């Protein structure tokens, strides 16, 4: 009886395909031809932060554009100040194989995790002054790829076991669990409404999950390789995803279809990190070609090249106000550009 | 700068000194990776070194030199993702069960995939042909041999450069196949280290130490040559 369900699923997929194709009256390129180009946006290294003993993997800005959290593969969480250049805190991790880090919006807790399959959230405002292990939760049978904070009480964590769950800092238990993708989850990205969040996995699929309802509402399968980066638009209506095919794809939630494909013939390295500015025009994508590229969301033209790294650009992040952009690579140097 | 800016600078200097001490401690120790299929006896190799966690670390000492070996504890079959995090290590030990011929092809494919990696191309690979006694007994019993599994074994001879000639020819053919697979797209930047051992051999630590010393020597030579 498996053939009946197989052909039913195939017919449903074909129906969804022909229903989505009918809504494609015109492309985004045909509409953005009259708008003026963005031009070459030249950027210079404003700040250079050194001190990491290993390769820089994850970084995150807090509520303000001043503090920054970064993780290093030697088991160190560093708190950087972009204005005074002085190190604020240094959290020693029990496991050095960290792959993700997050900063709570309240500015009191910081999460970390990785190959240890244990998510550790530390408190920064401890009355005792020193950093103490606040919540060391476990339960996943896979490596942690990304972690994000929804509020001062809940947290979302991705794992390599294809199953995600919403954890509560008060009790440390899975509040809501999801079905999961087809491959290992690679990255997450929350919406500005804090009610939805879109996740990209190895199956070249991006799924939008809800905090209240534990299920996926839409699915995007426009990519051709493993998706390693994802970032939501500031308005919460679209999101860009970068894959190892040296191509980035902008999927709109309202349109429920791909609108723009950033690609170049000379570019062959895969995308590692994607972030949007405060307006959304400039899309900064880190490539394994030792350079970062800035593209226009409407014109799809190269707006600038950043060659201030000597290794794979592992992470990048734009501040909430768009004053500066931090970039961390495997060269243990953290460059904050204008 | 207020009285607060100077205090922040002093705290930053203290954190930098702590990071320098941690880097010195990290440099004093050496790190190694351990990979292998479930059929291989890597657990016995870990247990014999008496000198839901997805990662397991074993700290031992060879010739007054510390070694921390990291092994996957609980993960899925996927390897393309987490293999990039274990880069920059001193060496990687790939355990293979040379007795069973069925899982031999999968082990060869895994070795070829790991060696030709684009990010791990600067890290050498150590191979330990474990379970030599079982393979010897199986090839001397006459029930199953490498003939029906590989046709090239029918046209391979023992090189000129208490063990029966059959086991010697078999292990030399296996080593030659491994060398031919490793040299493919090697570019000379990293070389493999094949060795023979068993589940009771206690001289494995000396072999690991010699391989790590040779790797460090090659790295120092590459640094001096400014490649």
């Amino acid at each position, epitope marked *: 009886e498996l053939d009946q369900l197989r052909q039913e699923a195939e017919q449903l997929k074909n129906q969804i395909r022909d229903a989505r194709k009918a809504c494609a009256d015109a492309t985004l390129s045909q509409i953005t031809n009259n708008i003026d180009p963005v031009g070459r946006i030249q950027m210079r290294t404003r700040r250079t932060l050194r001190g990491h003993l290993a390769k820089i993997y994850a970084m995150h800005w807090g509520t303000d554009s001043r503090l920054l959290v970064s993780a290093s593969q030697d088991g160190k969480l560093i708190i950087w100040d972009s204005y005074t250049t002085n190190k604020v805190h240094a959290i020693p991790l029990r496991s050095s194989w960290v792959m993700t880090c997050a900063y709570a919006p309240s500015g009191n807790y910081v999460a970390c995790g990785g190959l240890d399959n244990i998510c550790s959230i530390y408190n920064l405002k401890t*009355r*005792e*002054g020193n950093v103490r292990v606040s919540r060391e939760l476990a339960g996943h049978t896979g490596y942690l790829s990304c972690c994000r904070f929804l509020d001062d009480n809940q947290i979302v964590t991705s794992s390599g076991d294809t199953t995600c769950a919403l954890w509560d800092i008060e009790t440390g238990q899975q509040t809501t669990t999801f079905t999961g993708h087809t491959g290992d989850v690679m990255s997450l990205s929350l919406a500005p409404d804090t009610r939805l969040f879109v996740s990209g996995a190895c199956d070249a699929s991006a799924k939008l999950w809800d905090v209240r309802e534990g299920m996926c509402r839409q699915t995007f399968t426009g990519h051709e390789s493993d998706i390693n980066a994802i970032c939501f638009f500031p308005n919460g209506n679209a999101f860009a995803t970068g894959s190892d095919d040296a191509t980035c794809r902008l999927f709109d939630l309202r349109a429920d279809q791909e609108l723009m494909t950033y690609s170049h013939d000379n570019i062959i390295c895969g995308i590692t990190s994607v972030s949007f500015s405060k307006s959304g025009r400039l899309l900064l994508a880190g490539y394994d070609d030792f350079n970062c590229n800035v593209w226009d969301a409407l014109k799809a033209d190269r707006a600038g090249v950043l060659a201030g790294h000597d290794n794979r650009v592992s992470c990048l992040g734009v501040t909430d106000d768009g004053m500066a952009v931090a970039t961390g690579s495997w060269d243990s140097f953290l460059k904050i550009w204008n | 700068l*207020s009285a*607060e800016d100077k*205090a*922040a600078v002093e705290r930053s200097k*203290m954190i930098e000194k702590q990071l320098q001490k941690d880097k010195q401690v990290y440099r004093r120790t050496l790190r190694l990776l351990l990979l292998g299929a479930d059929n291989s006896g890597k657990s016995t190799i870990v247990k014999q070194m008496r000198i839901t966690s997805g990662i397991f670390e074993t700290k031992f000492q060879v010739d007054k030199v510390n070694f921390h070996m990291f092994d996957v504890g609980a993960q899925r079959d996927e390897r393309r993702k987490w293999i990039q995090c274990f880069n920059d290590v001193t060496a990687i030990i790939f355990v293979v069960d040379s007795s069973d011929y069925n899982r031999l092809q999968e082990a060869l494919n895994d070795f070829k995939s790991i060696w030709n990696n684009r990010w791990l191309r600067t890290i050498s690979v150590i191979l330990f042909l474990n379970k030599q006694d079982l393979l010897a007994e199986k090839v001397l019993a006459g029930k199953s041999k490498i003939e029906d599994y590989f046709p090239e074994f029918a046209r391979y001879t023992t090189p000129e450069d208490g063990e029966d000639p059959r086991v010697t020819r078999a292990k030399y053919f296996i080593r030659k196949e491994f060398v031919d697979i490793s040299t493919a797209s090697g570019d000379g930047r990293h070389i493999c280290y094949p060795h023979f051992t068993c589940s009771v051999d206690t001289e494995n630590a000396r072999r690991i130490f010699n391989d790590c010393k040779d790797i460090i020597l090659q790295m120092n030579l590459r640094e001096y040559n400014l490649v």
Partner: single-chain antibody
Amino acid sequence: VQLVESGGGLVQPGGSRKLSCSASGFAFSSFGMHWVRQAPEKGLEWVAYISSGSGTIYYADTVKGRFTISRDDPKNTLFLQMTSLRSEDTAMYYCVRSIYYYGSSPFDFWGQGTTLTVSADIVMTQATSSVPVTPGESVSISCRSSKSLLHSNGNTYLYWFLQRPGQSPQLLIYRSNLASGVPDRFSGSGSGTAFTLTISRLEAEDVGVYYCMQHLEYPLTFGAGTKLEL
């Protein structure tokens, strides 16, 4: 967090005394220490300050050369060796912890202190010293300094300390920015020169003396302190 002081008492003029202070409940090496004196029936006065690892030490211009502060990290202890004690040196000393970073709270916990009886820069001044007010009316304490504390970075170096009879001074505001452990009724406003502390609701445990302090430079200078009677 506990800061237990010892070594005080009666000392003859010209003698010496080492006031010991044991810290517990926190990382002693992470916080910087401050020895601050208080005269009987008078205001506060900063004496000395030491940083982490004894890398930066400062003394008050009135006590330069006589007092010497030191700290031991392995034992988590603090000492203040005094030499050539004068008749005016009779006062109560307090050891305070302070950590400096973005979003910190310097002078958050005040120790019990110990008593010791014998035998040009910025200065904070208060125009009012006593404000009689009912427990059902708001309070507005004004203050003015001789130099604008508004640094180029935009931070306001203003600290308020509420000392109650029998208890230690409690920190209310460290920078407008309300501190931890205090209700939201307290608020701070004003420019770089003039400052205003507003208390919306005055409870039965808010009575005491309010002292103002500036932190633009290392040499500190406390104000006269406004006492509330009820």
